[PDB]
Amino acid sequence: SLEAAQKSNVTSSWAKASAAWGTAGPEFFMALFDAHDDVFAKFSGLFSGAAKGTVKNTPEMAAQAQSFKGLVSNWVDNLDNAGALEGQCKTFAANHKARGISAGQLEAAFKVLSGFMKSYGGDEGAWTAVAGALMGEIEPDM
Ligand code: HEM
Ligand SMILES: [S]
């Protein structure tokens, strides 16, 4: 399910993306929005009706990339701690469900992120495994 090597690659590659997140965060969001238009739709409120092509350098974009980074960092720091993962996962799921976001959409986001992490030395198979363990804690609450 999740080997020691897989955890190690996830933690290391995350430390590298994290040091670059000021520029990489918005690029990840754009990759996601281009791949899934239905995902972009859920942010219409935050972006005030603006077209997708115009959002990358907005102050809203910047805040949203910082939000994303703070939860991902928490999860990566607790890979050997199922109890801690479950708690964060529950809050996360409750807040997103309340917005009418589906388990399928969350899953799409983890897929885009696993591909994106190849740039920071991430093993896509290690990122996919981590996503499968997290989704197993989230799905039951969606
Ligand atoms: C790996 C998957 C995801 C991560 C880490 C993530 C993380 C977060 C966090 C930490 C927040 C701010 C805390 C909160 O109010 O909930 C958040 C906000 C939000 N997320 Fe996500 N999320 C992801 C997936 C999504 C997905 C796929 C969508 C869209 C379909 C999305 C839509 C939103 C929106 C609409 C907000 C509220 C934005 C605002 O007005 O401040 N999130 N997400
Ligand atoms: S998000």
- 41: tokens are 């739709």
120 C-beta closer than 6 A to ligand 2: no
Resolution in A, one decimal?
Answer: 1.9
Method: X-ray
Q: Report CA(74)–ligand 1 centroid distance (Å).
A: 15
Which residues of the chain form beta strands (DSSP E)? none
- 39: tokens are 């995902």
Q: Which residue, among 106, 109, 110, has the nearest Cα to 131 in the 3D structure?
A: 110
Asked whether 42 and 99 are in contact (CB, 8 A), the reply is yes
130 C-beta closer than 6 A to ligand 1: no
68 C-beta closer than 6 A to ligand 2: yes
- Give the CATH number of domain 1-142: 1.10.490.10
Gyration radius of the chain over CA positions: 15
Residue corresponding to tokens 């991902």 = 72
- Residue 102 CA, closest ligand 1 atom number: 30
Alpha carbon 72 to chain centroid, angstroms: 6
Asked whether residue 96 is marked as a ligand-binding residue, the answer is: yes
Q: Which residue, among 10, 3, 19, 1, has the nearest Cα to 123 in the 3D structure?
A: 10
Asked whether 76 and 10 are in contact (CB, 8 A), the reply is yes
Q: Which residue, among 76, 94, 95, 69, has the nearest Cα to 133 in the 3D structure?
A: 76
Q: Report CA(77)–ligand 2 centroid distance (Å).
A: 19
What residues have CB less than 8 Å from 123, skipping those under 6 apart? 6, 9, 13
Report the alpha-carbon distance of residue 49 to residue 139 in Å, rounded. Answer: 30
